[PDB]
Paper text:
Here, we combine structural, cellular, and evolutionary analyses to demonstrate that SepF is the FtsZ anchor in the human-associated archaeon Methanobrevibacter smithii. M. smithii SepF binds to membranes and to FtsZ, inducing filament bundling. High-resolution crystal structures of archaeal SepF alone and in complex with the FtsZ C-terminal domain (FtsZCTD) reveal that SepF forms a dimer with a homodimerization interface driving a binding mode that is different from that previously reported in bacteria.
We determined the crystal structure of MsSepFcore, at 1.4 Å resolution. The protein is a dimer in solution, with each protomer consisting of a 5-stranded β-sheet flanked by 2 α-helices. In addition, a helical turn insertion (η1), between strand β2 and helix α2, is conserved in archaeal sequences but is absent in bacterial homologs. Despite their quite similar monomeric structure, the dimeric arrangement of archaeal SepF differs from that observed for the functional dimer in CgSepF, where the dimer interface is formed by a 4 α-helical bundle. Interestingly, the functional dimer (as defined by its complex with FtsZ) strikingly differs between MsSepF, where it is formed via a β-β interface, and CgSepF, where it is formed via an α-α interface. Importantly, a bacterial-like α-α interface is not possible in archaeal SepF because a crucial glycine residue (Gly114 in CgSepF) buried at the center of the bacterial interface is substituted by charged residues with longer side chains (Lys, Glu, Asp) in archaeal sequences, precluding such interaction to occur. However, the only other available bacterial SepF structure (CgSepF) revealed that a C-terminal helix α3 interacts with the β-sheet of SepF and would therefore preclude formation of a β-β interface. Remarkably, helix α3 is predicted to be conserved in most bacterial sequences including B. subtilis, but not in Archaea. In fact, we (and others) did not obtain conclusive experimental evidence that MsSepF polymerizes, and the three available archaeal SepF structures provide no hints about a possible mechanism.
Residue numbers in the entry:
A (entry chain A), B (entry chain A): 65 to 149
């Protein structure tokens, strides 16, 4: 399919991430660093939406790296399993 | 399908990464930090195998984050497109 890479800057960008995972069943490599730096409130909202996707839609969300101006998480929809070796 | 997460420590682990992308058509989120620190030669070999997968098998390989003890690259097989918004 497609794996989407997104660095959201607005609440609408967050809702686009949600739609990609839930409606399109595309994994998203999400960079939360802009929200974390510039809008604590929208950073918190993004975390709440990730919580909702995990709890209510069966998505996985795995921290990859939070370092040097990036805060990278992979969100995988139900049907694309993360497998760590 | 499956997205594999692997931090190789040996040449055999590298060849397993290759097999996942080429034979199983699974994307791999690859952490090269152990090779980079502990074996420059095997780090270089991993780079050569990534080059071969891109050039000869149509794979994509996109740097995600090299920071604070991680060197993360996503390798996507032909048929799983990376899409950046």
């Amino acid at each position: 399919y497609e794996i989407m890479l997104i660095r959201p800057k607005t609440i609408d960008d967050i809702n686009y991430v949600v739609d990609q995972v839930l409606e399109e069943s595309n994994p998203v490599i999400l960079d939360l660093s802009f929200l974390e730096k510039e809008s604590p409130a929208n950073f918190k909202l993004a975390g709440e939406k990730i919580k909702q996707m995990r709890s209510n839609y069966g998505a996985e969300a795995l921290l990859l790296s939070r370092c040097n101006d990036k805060n990278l998480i992979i969100i995988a929809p139900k049907g694309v399993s993360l497998v760590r070796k």
